Structures are given as structure tokens and as C-alpha cells.
Design a protein around this ligand. Structure first.
Ligand SMILES: OC[C@H]1O[C@@H](O[C@H]2[C@H](O)[C@@H](O)[C@H](O)O[C@@H]2CO)[C@H](O)[C@@H](O)[C@@H]1O
Length: 293
């Protein structure tokens, strides 16, 4: 059955969006809307192996106390973003493995939804063959270790419908043990329509023994900006998409989620914009305004 059905997704009470909505003077309808919508909580190399267990236990326990399903995104892979606007990740595979162990320790047997490494498999060809193999091994390690929490619904990130082909991505998913996870994620931090992503997801599902998927609908209400380089990097004219739900239109689509947090910058984007991940109230307002709110 769909592990995501049956309770609301957790609204993070401490998100930058909540802080902005509470501080708004006068109150702002767009910030409030965004702030009250459940998103995902992103963890990376700022949360070292030594302590991330406690961070995870705290967040999943808080979500359980709220009667809700926490969504956590892991974004610590070595050579992350191939050193572009969202550069970072742990220094080595050894560090990354210790990080995954600590995250798993914090999960215990608690309910959680885990999005594993946005872009990692899709971007892997920027690496040398040896480094690419290591990356696949690390994503497979995440799957094998995290799924030891029976109550973790694990979705390995699989890019989007205009990145790798369904066949190419399915090969990579099968290589990293997608069969042990619940499935895969699509459209993370991107803008493609839900319909387009459903067709792509059902194709990958067909090639991965019926695996299930989630789609990031945080910013896809108006589809993507015109085809261009960096059309994914703080594009204007985009809108909030469907709020998180399990009432989807795909046979193997477990949920629409907001994985990316609306309002956060995608990077400097060659325009001196705020660093990737920094909350920009104006960006959240624009996305909400464009959706008619
Ligand atoms: O999808 C968000 C993700 O996009 C990355 O760029 C991709 C792009 O999405 C794809 O359409 C194009 O064909 O390939 C590039 C990479 O070569 C971007 O680099 C990431 O930061 C971002 O998270």
C-alpha cells in the first residue's frame, strides 16, 4: 500500500517561510500560504555524522508528536552539484557512509519519507568513470542502510523528464537497488508539469519492476520557463503547483510533494542572486502571486 497515505505531511514550524510569515508587518497572505504548506527538510554536510542522528531523531519525533509524516531530503553526496551553484557535499565516500549510518541511527523505526540525493544519479556523468562508480555505490549504500527502518519510505532521486531518458535513469535506479526502496523522486527543484512527470514516472516504473514515485510540485503550477540555459536557476514567471497530496493522477505516483522549499534561491545564477538555499521572501511571494494567491 502507499506508505504516504493516512497522515498529513509535517509542516516545519521553524522554516524560513514561517519566520518570514510571522515577521511580516502587516501579515502577508502569500508568505502565510507558503509557510503553512508542508515541504521537506534538507540535510547536508552542515550536519556532521557525529550529530545528524540527533537532528534526525528530533525532527522525526516532532513530526510523530504532530501526527504527521516528516519528509527529509539528503543532499550530502561527494562532488555535489559537480561544483556548480549548489557545490558542497561530504569530502569523501567514507565520510558519506558514516553520515548515512548516523541518519539511519536517528531514524530508528520511526516514520519518515526520505528523498535521496537530488540530481546525484542524473548528474553522474560529470564525474570520471571511477568517481561515477563510487557515486552509484554511495547511493546504493544509502538505500541499503536507510531501508533498515521499515517505516522509512525511501525515494531515490531520478532527475526529471528532460534530463536522462527513462531507460538510462531506470538502469541507474536498478543499479542502486531501487527495488529495496519504495521508488524514486522526480522534478526536484524544477518546474515541469505534473502531467509530463507522470508520463515519465510511469515509464521508469515499468522499467524498475513497478516502483513508485513522488513528484516535486513546489514550483510547477505554470510549467517551465522557455527552454534555455539556466532556465532552472531562479526563473521568473513560475507558480506554486499543487499542494502536497496523495490524491495523484498517476498509477504509481504515491504523492505530489514540495521537496524544494518555495522562496529559496537556486543560486547566484550568474546574476549575483542569493546563494543557493537562502530564503528570499520576494521569491515566495512571486511564486504565490503567479498561482493567483
Ligand atoms: O533540475 C534541477 C537541477 O538542474 C540541474 O541542471 C540540469 C537541468 O535540470 C537539465 O534540464 C539539463 O539538461 O541538465 C542540467 C545539468 O547538466 C542543475 O545543474 C542543478 O543545480 C539543479 O538542482
Amino acid at each position: 500500500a502507499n506508505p504516504l497515505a493516512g497522515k498529513p505531511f509535517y509542516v516545519d514550524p521553524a522554516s524560513a517561510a514561517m519566520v518570514a510569515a510571522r515577521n511580516a508587518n502587516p501579515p502577508n497572505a502569500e508568505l502565510t500560504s507558503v509557510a503553512n504548506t508542508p515541504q521537506s527538510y534538507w540535510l547536508d554536510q552542515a550536519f556532521p555524522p557525529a550529530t545528524v542522528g540527533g537532528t534526525v531523531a528530533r525532527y522525526t519525533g516532532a513530526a510523530q508528536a504532530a501526527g504527521a509524516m516528516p519528509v527529509l531530503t539528503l543532499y550530502g553526496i561527494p562532488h555535489r552539484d559537480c561544483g556548480s551553484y549548489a557545490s558542497g557535499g561530504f569530502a569523501t565516500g567514507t565520510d558519506y557512509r558514516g553520515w548515512i549510518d548516523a541518519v539511519a541511527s536517528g531514524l530508528g523505526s520511526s516514520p519518515a519519507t526520505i528523498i535521496v540525493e537530488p540530481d546525484a544519479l542524473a548528474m553522474a556523468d560529470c564525474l570520471s568513470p571511477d568517481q561515477r562508480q563510487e557515486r552509484f555505490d554511495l547511493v546504493r549504500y544509502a538505500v541499503d542502510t536507510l531501508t533498515r527502518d521499515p517505516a522509512a519510505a525511501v525515494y531515490v532521486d531520478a532527475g526529471h523528464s528532460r534530463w536522462l531518458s527513462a531507460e538510462a535513469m531506470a538502469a541507474r535506479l536498478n543499479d542502486v537497488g531501487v527495488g529495496r526502496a519504495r521508488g524514486f523522486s522526480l522534478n526536484v527543484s524544477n518546474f515541469y508539469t505534473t502531467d509530463e512527470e507522470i508520463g515519465y514516472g510511469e515509464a521508469i516504473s515499468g522499467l524498475t519492476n513497478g516502483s513508485h514515485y513522488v513528484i516535486d510540485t513546489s514550483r510547477n503550477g505554470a510549467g517551465p520557463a522557455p527552454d534555455a540555459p539556466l532556465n532552472w536557476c531562479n526563473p521568473s514567471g513560475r507558480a506554486l503547483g499543487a499542494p502536497p497530496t496523495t490524491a495523484t493522477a498517476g498509477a504509481h505516483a504515491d504523492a505530489y510533494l514540495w521537496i524544494k522549499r518555495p522562496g529559496e534561491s537556486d543560486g547566484t545564477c550568474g546574476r549575483g542572486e542569493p546563494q543557493a538555499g537562502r530564503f528570499v521572501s520576494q521569491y515566495a511571494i512571486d511564486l504565490a502571486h503567479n498561482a493567483g494567491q
